[PDB]
């Protein structure tokens, strides 16, 4: 038996008694056939048909199986995605299911399930880091990167406990921080490392790697691509292991980089902008990482949040918007969203095997109060931003779940002045948006904020002018405002409870007296909405046309008034209803509205009046409307007409859109509705019958659908028990899911026999007229058929719940299967006895005769053909609900649910009006979940009749028919195999008469033009072997008008959809022997498994035999697809545009598991010399992949690195010396040298198996001829030996594809890499002239051509014998010396990526000929100076790519440059500075490292100071190389400030100018923006005594330029390091000394920057405004002036003014005092007089935003001082 693990919302559903017998029968059919599909070696029909059906079963019944059945499903799905080398598209199909079984962690414990991880790594590395799939060998899906990560994430908490040191042993040797192989490891660490381990396993957890990898993270100070992965790792480590990390030693380093990742402009020049900060921290991962730190006993992370926001409050102000605001609004959206989820995780979540937080690490009531109080001031400034109020109201909702008494009064103090202002209208858009998130916490008066619903009704009454027909932004947010209040509070009078009753409290009796205005709200809501309608009627201005479409902005106001009025009028007492029903009736019947805009809009407002009480409302509408239709239609002969009377034509829509109340209470009016349908449905006016068809439609909709009738917040309703319960208690009703009290409308036999009586009196008389017209015996008009089809369409679409689909079962051509392919059946509650009529089959036979008559006898009747598409679109796939209306109510539910949800305590607070709709969304999901559908013989005919309409004469008819055609291809099982042979019949050359509409209509059938089914690019060989040749066979002969421009865009879209969507198809579906799990799932499940067969004696041999036949035909159809394309591209009289598609389909077939067939190897090699540049650009990309296929598999062996190097920790070990190329380079005995090819090996640690290549000649033989050769696949040898082929190949490659966009092609490189690797310079004597001719040419086309061949020689010379290596460089070392001599402007990026490419993954031993040539003379300039710079830039990329493997050549190049760097030019200085950052990149100071052999920054900079000692003319020449180096080592080094470089700062301050203008020298201009890059760089917290010693020394007394720039250094250096300094509390006393002691400067320009610095430090709360600060200024202002004393008195006026400018948007308690005595220095002398005039005029500028709130902090005696005061500039005097 099954104890269900987790189910759904189906208990409530009305047919809940039948959801156990139907669910368990499908689950038993899952266990049978999914086990039998795997065990009978079948994945093409059957492995996917029951993976989809379990994917359907999870999305329909929750889990609803047992724990033993849940580990059978996981361990079957896991072993299928971990098959070695599957088909990768079906690997995702098993993947998304296997994510769904595992994403709910609480369902399966750790002791109940375990999964290995190395099957995931071979799965990931083949799909994510494939060594193919850039040469054209594999073709992956587009979604493969994120599905595999979210699968490992779902499999990660079930990895075994001994399998993370097993995981820290494999990629820990990849952590050399210089190669690209480190972010290989760090992305594996973020994905694979187990962090959600139980607390008895942390020693086998993060403690193996935490201090090893947080110590790496704190030591970088660049921003690599892998630093953003560790913040995604450490966040996930933090959020699971709360209370087991001590983040306190690392918390100032964490918040200083979250601040730094905001990238805030600070300093009034503020940037020599580092472009390395493109990569940064995803703050959405940082919010996860702050939130998991807060609950500690020492509240240390809390004040770093208060230090964070208070430093950035001025950026949330709505005047200060900029680039930073998108990260900064996103920070407010997520931190209250995440603190609440942590509070739900520790207060209301049920326990599971996931470890809870400890009691010591849990958020206290103080801790969440102090979180709101440090975020409330930035969220209220975000409320009024220019970018909207969406991010603030989502923040303000989640803050209101925690502390309502602290967050709701600061909002409603700004809301009441916003609803009555008539000036600053933006608040009403933004304050109302924020009360809607507040609304759940506002109407619910808790034990802290009980005054909430006192503000309910006055905000609700003052919002009534918001419904105005002038704004629509106010009107939508007003309709959203009142509907979100009038679904919380019942609108009931409370006066009979206002008598003697002791239940009312002080606040609750204040509510009941205010409920006298509930009727006055609803009636004034209507008188405001009637003017909203009657002033929005449609004006017919243009006399020719008729605007019939309600626009999108007006369709929202219909639905916005259909929502916001039906929610008032449901949440409403019956006494207030019926006095408001008459206001609707006395409006909508005394007027005559235009039926287009105001017709849909009045009748929807009446539709709301009927759906709330259908008895009392239908007593007066349908007697009124039917008595006036029969008066105004059947009196005269208005059956035949041209235009109806606008009142008759009104009262149909007033009746049609009103008769869709609950269909039980329409049986009273049977003999009135049928009477008008028998009189106005057969009219002549094209709007007259469509309003009558909408009447017939909605009557059938109301009498066969299951839907809820009421949507009230209380299940009894607000009307049926008056005064039995007190209504003002259920205002904050949480609306429980159990005992919901939902009321349904299941169709009775009275409502069903009437549903067929309308169908037996209007469908059948409209079907016999269509029958005799399609037979030739009635001959109706063109509009008479059009009128009759609407009756057939509105009876089908509208009563389709009663009509069974089809019968007939087409077989014998589809896919045969060994297992069941039965269609699923879901009882959506109705029987539909299926004995009497079956009306759906009759319509399908009338149409196939009617459509056969119309397409032959009248091909021009378009509007009849549009209806036939609408009926076949509903004869096939229409049960009771619509496939698009469900998707728009699914989105409208998540728009309403996610808006008003109590995230603090779980599912128990969703309101009843949401939950009733979601149960209806569960019924409507079951009405559309037709997963399996058997392709029957009627479905073989109805789609082929759509295929005639998809190819017909008119493009309006073809476009509508193809969309039904494509939707009908996705529904039925194996239809696409039936219809490809039928749709390609319009594309054959041999066809006699095929029109151009016939032709291109069939190519819009192939080009799917949607997201559902691409019919030319299916994922099967039996379909692709027909569609791809037929595209290339078209063209050469067809009726293919290639001169029409639309058909050329069609083939360019049909070819560009194939290359975008194609994904490589498997050839071997060999299910491995490790699927005993399938036998363990078929057998012995038995708890739901009612399937007693359990047999497979020799059917498993038949399944193996049919699989090997599938494996044979998939191999056969592949090699037939190659032959049919080559017979179509080498076809005579093709157009050119059809062979580029034909080569384009051959480039996708080049496979890795196979070798391409012989005629295609001959093809792509011979098409390397093609005249079309597009073809031979593809032949380069294909022959490079052929040479990968023909690779000859070198042998390997394993090195113990203790055996070599003589003896047995992160860099440059003692047992690592053989990897470093200095002296012992191989000259004669080249073998026995242990060449380690790739760079990163052996840096950090050594792997378990360090693997190098073999010795001499154990690799395969190199020099060979055609005798010992594969005699079928090296015809490529025959072409590169022919000198006519080579001389034409060298000639085509030296063309110019473009002059600007012409770079070193990395795909011509892989062409020549695969040549000289595979053939071992058998072609190099045939390329003797064509290498020596191209180097001696001035053209950049040939220098680029030769460079791909040069680097392809070098990286092809990996496995060459020592004879061939020396014979290579004997002609190659003079060849590069020629090329490096004649290097040009358009060539040094080619050579800069030529020999920097050739040093990629080679040992520095094996290429010393470069490193003796490239380091020979880079700056000994034989010709020019730009040549010497380009000769040095190519040296840079080669030495950087062999990063740590060489200490020696870095010294030999540093020893070369250390005399030369003084006497060079600027283009060489910009290279030497770019080279010296790679000479010193190895000096890293990483946490467990060793001082490397590679040259040191401290050993070099001490020599630089020895040469700059006369400065502290030839030293100023040396600064232009040091400054250009310190510009390059800004973010391009692993430690941005070595302490010997820090005293280069006082030499830079006296040079860097003040104004920073373009008129200064290059020494000055490069010294100013070198200080900007060092201040904006980080620093370790043991450098705060070291840099502050420098800046106190530099600003002590040197020169006023240096005192100025120390201040502008500080302001953008204690901000980007703001929490390093605030941890070292001795440093903030030294900043406060230096800034204040430099207000006393002898230079005025220094001291005003000292006050600008101090004003910002006070503003970011780096310096608290203590009392001895103000005593130091207030006892400095009162200073006598006898005539040094002037500068002494001024510095107090700077100091008072610095405090004034420090709070620009608030007036604190200290603020009015130090404005009054600040204003007393206004008649002071002139240096003081400017400053007081600058400070007060800047005060008044920033304080006119909300000065009415600022003036209350002033006395009335002090307002007369500040208002009447002169601070005006010179041009007012
Ligand atoms: O069916 P939908 O629309 O796709 O949405 C499902 C979600 O998708 P899924 O069912 O897995 O496909 C699933 O969320 P995730 O698995 O992704 O986390 C459920 O979460 P869960 O219940 O496990 O988690 P908890 O209860 O929130 O802790 C439900 O989310 P809540 O409302 O928060 O959950 P409640 O249903 O209210 O209990 C939600 O049910 P609704 O239909 O009402 O939106
Ligand atoms: O010398 P490289 O240009 O750096 O290329 C090598 C080379 O691949 P090619 O056959 O394309 O030249 C290796 O092949 P072998 O010498 O071992 O025959 C291959 O090794 P595998 O075939 O075992 O994959 C290795 O790949 P890897 O670094 O994953 O070991 C790959 O290096 P790249 O992937 O960086 O190109």
mmCIF file of N, CA and C in Angstrom, residues 944 947 978-986:
data_model
loop_
_atom_site.group_PDB
_atom_site.id
_atom_site.type_symbol
_atom_site.label_atom_id
_atom_site.label_comp_id
_atom_site.label_asym_id
_atom_site.label_seq_id
_atom_site.Cartn_x
_atom_site.Cartn_y
_atom_site.Cartn_z
ATOM 1 N N UNK A 944 -4.427 16.379 -42.597
ATOM 2 C CA UNK A 944 -4.195 16.499 -44.037
ATOM 3 C C UNK A 944 -5.145 17.493 -44.697
ATOM 4 N N UNK A 947 -3.574 20.510 -44.033
ATOM 5 C CA UNK A 947 -2.396 20.629 -44.878
ATOM 6 C C UNK A 947 -2.760 21.196 -46.242
ATOM 7 N N UNK A 978 4.189 10.618 -40.349
ATOM 8 C CA UNK A 978 3.200 10.358 -41.387
ATOM 9 C C UNK A 978 3.111 11.510 -42.374
ATOM 10 N N UNK A 979 3.433 12.721 -41.931
ATOM 11 C CA UNK A 979 3.070 13.924 -42.667
ATOM 12 C C UNK A 979 4.265 14.553 -43.382
ATOM 13 N N UNK A 980 5.493 14.269 -42.935
ATOM 14 C CA UNK A 980 6.675 14.618 -43.731
ATOM 15 C C UNK A 980 6.669 14.013 -45.135
ATOM 16 N N UNK A 981 6.329 12.723 -45.351
ATOM 17 C CA UNK A 981 6.220 12.262 -46.745
ATOM 18 C C UNK A 981 5.070 12.878 -47.518
ATOM 19 N N UNK A 982 4.087 13.469 -46.846
ATOM 20 C CA UNK A 982 2.983 14.094 -47.556
ATOM 21 C C UNK A 982 3.257 15.567 -47.831
ATOM 22 N N UNK A 983 4.012 16.240 -46.960
ATOM 23 C CA UNK A 983 4.254 17.668 -47.152
ATOM 24 C C UNK A 983 5.438 17.920 -48.085
ATOM 25 N N UNK A 984 6.350 16.959 -48.237
ATOM 26 C CA UNK A 984 7.449 17.106 -49.181
ATOM 27 C C UNK A 984 7.040 16.789 -50.609
ATOM 28 N N UNK A 985 5.782 16.408 -50.836
ATOM 29 C CA UNK A 985 5.302 16.189 -52.190
ATOM 30 C C UNK A 985 5.110 17.495 -52.940
ATOM 31 N N UNK A 986 5.014 18.616 -52.235
ATOM 32 C CA UNK A 986 4.981 19.918 -52.873
ATOM 33 C C UNK A 986 6.371 20.480 -53.119
#
